[PDB]
Design a protein around this ligand. Structure first.
Ligand SMILES: COc1cc(CN2[C@H](c3ccnc(OC)c3)N[C@@H](c3ccnc(OC)c3)[C@@H]2c2ccnc(OC)c2)ccn1
Lengths: 300, 237
């Protein structure tokens, strides 16, 4: 179990760690988060009490270094940083635990939610979507735009998701216009899985990362990407059977963890009714279908 | 954007554009089987592709053989239409290719867009207009060539005959739409109106009678009267 210490908490802020969040008052004695489970990526995010706009946060993996938070009063935000000096870090963390000023990552033992939401998410893949290679952690926020979004403006601050476009040459083979548009199996299986992603685990990882950026930051372009990767599978007649079963589990926990009062903007009516009720895979998402019906029967 | 009564005169500017109507591509009679079930029998169809500027009617004849052994034929018909329109554009020299294609039914948008992926600078547009192009098979010469075809064909018609020598594209288009609207609402009376006077004839390469300017006015008036009456009957007004 690892620790993300905080230098101080000078401004009133709602802090999140994965699917948990805590309210911290201006200059409240707060020096970080302990007992963070090793073996998964994590995200630590922020919403200032004064500006409900711009949620922001950092994706990180504690196996990849020692990381801490410090408020920057010039740039006006809580910044993640890496401590290279291991002994300086152990000592900061020990002093803060001894004075019991750290909150404990509050994992229920029976609960696999975070694992289920991040099963396929790798930090090495996050870092290729969020390009900033001088740091081992990745910044994301509400307003960042995606590469596809930027085609239709600052590239350093883009989310480099894989571009999916059903009405593109990449998606439609010459001579197979109707076939490839009504049955996206060749685009899913040959172009994306074999060509670009290499395997389904990387595909599932980007899909999972997109959903989480949409949920935690209200990032609209991540939400477009998530729905797009769902719809590409649902609109393929020919999907490996292991992928469909895993997709059903993935979507189930995403739908289970979503804030109930956010389903209006985060969930796209057309994609879901199509995937669940018209698509080739309308009958392969039993669990996802059951939780959507019992929880958002209005959407459908 | 979408084409409507506000941006109507755009059809007659000097940007090449085509209307595409797919209503008569897939045509069936419906009949009873020996066992008392219902089956369809297809007949020859056509894509109606019209330059509203010159009068060119690129009529692509859709032979019943294109449906043989195929399923979901009303959906295929839309893709076949898009395939044939795209092939036509490819066959044309660059300076003859349209800058816009306006489809009369929105279901054609995605099939055409997909088939035209190679022409990113051709705009594909729907329209809010209720154009009467479905009535094209009420034009005797066009119906005849479609029904007699024994193979796929493309026949180039001048749907304005020689009108542009005397009137503008705008006025020619309005005359065409008025004739087709009349044929669509009451084919019998519409055709009675056009052929009542045996002294008026149709030029061998032309679709409509040789009316003088004043006869066209009388005809155009008779066609309006027809279209209004039929409307009273329709609704009870
Ligand atoms: C591929 O196009 C064609 C066209 C036709 C032949 N058409 C037709 C046409 C007209 C009427 N009935 C038809 O009943 C088969 C076919 N359109 C003609 C035409 C008219 C105006 N501009 C035109 O183009 C700008 C064309 C032309 C034709 C044939 C015979 N006589 C003509 O006389 C001078 C002219 C036949 C076969 N192939």
């Amino acid at each position: 179990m690892n620790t993300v210490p905080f230098t101080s908490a000078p401004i009133e802020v709602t802090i999140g760690i994965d699917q948990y969040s805590f309210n911290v008052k201006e200059n409240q004695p707060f020096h970080g988060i302990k007992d963070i489970p090793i073996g998964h990526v994590h995200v630590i995010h922020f919403q200032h009490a004064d500006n409900s706009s711009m949620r922001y946060g950092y994706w990180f993996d504690c196996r990849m270094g020692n990381f801490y938070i410090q408020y920057d009063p010039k740039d006006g935000l809580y910044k993640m940083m890496e401590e290279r000096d291991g002994a300086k870090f152990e000592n900061i963390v020990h002093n803060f635990k001894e004075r019991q000023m750290m909150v404990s990552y509050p994992k229920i033992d029976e609960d696999d939610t975070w694992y289920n939401l991040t099963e396929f998410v790798q930090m090495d893949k996050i870092r290729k979507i969020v390009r900033k290679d001088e740091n081992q952690f990745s910044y994301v926020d509400s307003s960042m735009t995606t590469v596809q979004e930027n085609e239709l403006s600052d590239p350093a601050h883009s989310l480099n998701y894989t571009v999916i476009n059903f009405k593109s040459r990449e998606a439609i083979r010459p001579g197979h216009e109707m076939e490839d548009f009504l049955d996206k199996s060749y685009y899913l299986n040959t172009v994306m899985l074999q060509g670009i992603f290499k395997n389904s685990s990387n595909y599932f990882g980007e899909l999972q990362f997109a959903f989480l950026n949409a949920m935690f930051f209200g990032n609209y372009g991540s939400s477009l990407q998530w729905h797009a990767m769902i719809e590409l599978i649902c609109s393929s007649a020919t999907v490996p059977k292991h992928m469909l079963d895993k997709l059903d589990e993935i979507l189930y926990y995403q739908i289970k963890t979503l804030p109930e009062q956010y389903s209006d903007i985060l969930l796209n009516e057309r994609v879901w009714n199509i995937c669940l009720y018209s698509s080739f895979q309308k009958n392969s998402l039993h669990n996802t279908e059951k939780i959507m019906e019992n929880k958002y029967p209005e959407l459908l | 954007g979408a084409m409507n009564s506000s941006n109507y005169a755009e059809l007659f500017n000097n940007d090449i554009k085509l209307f595409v109507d797919d209503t008569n591509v897939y045509r069936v009679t419906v009949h009873k089987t020996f066992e008392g079930n219902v089956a369809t029998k297809a007949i020859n169809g056509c894509i109606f592709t019209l330059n509203p500027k010159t009068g060119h009617l690129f009529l692509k004849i859709i032979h019943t053989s294109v449906w043989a052994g195929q399923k979901r034929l009303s959906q295929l018909a839309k893709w076949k239409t898009a395939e044939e329109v795209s092939a036509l554009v490819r066959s044309l020299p660059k300076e003859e290719q349209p800058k816009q294609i306006i489809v009369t039914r929105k279901a054609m948008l995605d099939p055409l867009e997909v088939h035209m992926l190679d022409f990113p600078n051709i705009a594909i547009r729907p329209t809010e207009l209720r154009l009467p192009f479905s009535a094209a098979m009420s034009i005797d010469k066009l119906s005849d060539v479609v029904m007699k075809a024994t193979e796929p064909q493309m026949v180039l018609f001048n749907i304005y005959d020689d009108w542009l020598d005397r009137i503008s594209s705008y006025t020619a288009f309005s005359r065409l739409t008025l004739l087709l609207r009349a044929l669509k609402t009451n084919e019998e009376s519409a055709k009675m109106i056009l052929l009542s006077d045996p002294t008026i004839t149709i030029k061998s390469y032309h679709l409509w009678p040789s009316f003088t300017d004043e006869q066209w006015i009388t005809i155009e008036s008779q066609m309006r009267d027809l279209i209004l009456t039929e409307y009273g009957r329709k609704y009870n007004v």
